[PDB]
Amino acid sequence: MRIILLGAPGAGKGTQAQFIMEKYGIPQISTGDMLRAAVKSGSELGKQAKDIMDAGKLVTDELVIALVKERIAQEDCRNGFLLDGFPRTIPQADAMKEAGINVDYVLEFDVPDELIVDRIVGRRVHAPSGRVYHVKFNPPKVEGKDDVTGEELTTRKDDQEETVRKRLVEYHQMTAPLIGYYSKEAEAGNTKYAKVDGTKPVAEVRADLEKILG
Ligand SMILES: Nc1ncnc2c1ncn2[C@@H]1O[C@H](COP(=O)(O)OP(=O)(O)OP(=O)(O)OP(=O)(O)OP(=O)(O)OC[C@H]2O[C@@H](n3cnc4c(N)ncnc43)[C@H](O)[C@@H]2O)[C@@H](O)[C@H]1O
């Protein structure tokens, strides 16, 4: 099974991706997590991403495409995968389409702009795994610790209000058109498309997604 998650920044995509991955035994493919890891380790492909993410700007189509095609050739992607953060632009989507990569589900998360900032400012992550928490809305079992490893959570350098505003602007301009792109794909019988209310509690959105996938 192959899935793509659509939605504005902080809509809850990464959060819900964790549940799908464990349930369906398919790997989460997060371009945001790769880019941050590349910066961290200084990987040839992705190292350059530091300043761009800082400014709240999108990284080049070609860099991310390369990261995805490299990552997606991996063996763990034999039986399917979940795309989370890719595609982010129309050319990114088209690159994937003409490579002959079709998916089964495109899942859109519907979340109002006014909720995004307070979500992102309270976000805490476990960098090694990509697991995400919220200090008020979705806290770890033990404060400041990852549930799975118990390791100290951190805050992303680009999770400040001003930076978040910029990502929003970028999304509505560059990424929003992907909704129509895949709605069109769905009508061609190339995939199934669905939208969920991303303002429900984490448990409920997970249940909604499972009704669609299971
Ligand atoms: N394909 C690409 N092409 C070019 N550049 C790319 C790229 N991909 C990445 N980049 C680059 O890297 C940057 C960052 O992108 P990215 O790594 O994706 O972070 P983002 O833009 O800030 O938004 P996310 O997609 O990480 O949010 P989310 O949908 O996962 O919501 P989350 O589960 O975290 O949850 C949000 C918060 O609220 C909480 N929360 C989650 N669910 C709920 C709920 N149901 N109710 C209440 N609170 C909730 C959480 O615990 C959390 O704190 C870009 O700006 C760019 O430079």
Description:
The protein is α/β, with parallel strands linked by helices. The chain has one domain (1-214): Rossmann fold, CATH 3.40.50. 43% of the residues lie in helices and 15% in strands. It is built from nine helices and seven strands. Helix 1 (13-24) packs across helix 9 (202-213) and helix 4 packs parallel to helix 5 (90-97). The longest helix is centred in the last third of the chain and has 15 residues, at 161-175. The chain is globular and about 45 Å long. It binds BIS(adenosine)-5'-pentaphosphate. Its main location: cytoplasm. ATP binds at residues 10-15, 119, 123, 132-133, 200. Pathway: Purine metabolism; AMP biosynthesis via salvage pathway; AMP from ADP: step 1/1. Catalyzes the reversible transfer of the terminal phosphate group between ATP and AMP. Plays an important role in cellular energy homeostasis and in adenine nucleotide metabolism.
Features:
two-stranded antiparallel sheet; 43% helix; binds BIS(adenosine)-5'-pentaphosphate; alpha/beta; ATP-binding; 7 strands; five-stranded parallel sheet; 214 residues; globular; kinase; 9 helices; 15% strand; AMP binding; Rossmann fold
| Bound ions, cofactors and other small molecules, one mention each | BIS(adenosine)-5'-pentaphosphate
The shape, in one word, is globular
Order of helices and strands: EHEHHHEHEHEEHHEH
> How far from one another are the termini?
11 Å
What strand line-up does the widest sheet have? 2-3-1-4-7
Helix content: 40-55%
| Integer tally of domains | 1
Number of strands: 7
Biggest sheet statistics: 5 strands, parallel
Catalytic activity: AMP + ATP = 2 ADP
GO molecular function: adenylate kinase activity; AMP binding; ATP binding; magnesium ion binding; nucleoside diphosphate kinase activity
Main location: cytoplasm
Keywords: Acetylation, ATP-binding, Cytoplasm, Kinase, Nucleotide biosynthesis, Nucleotide-binding, Transferase
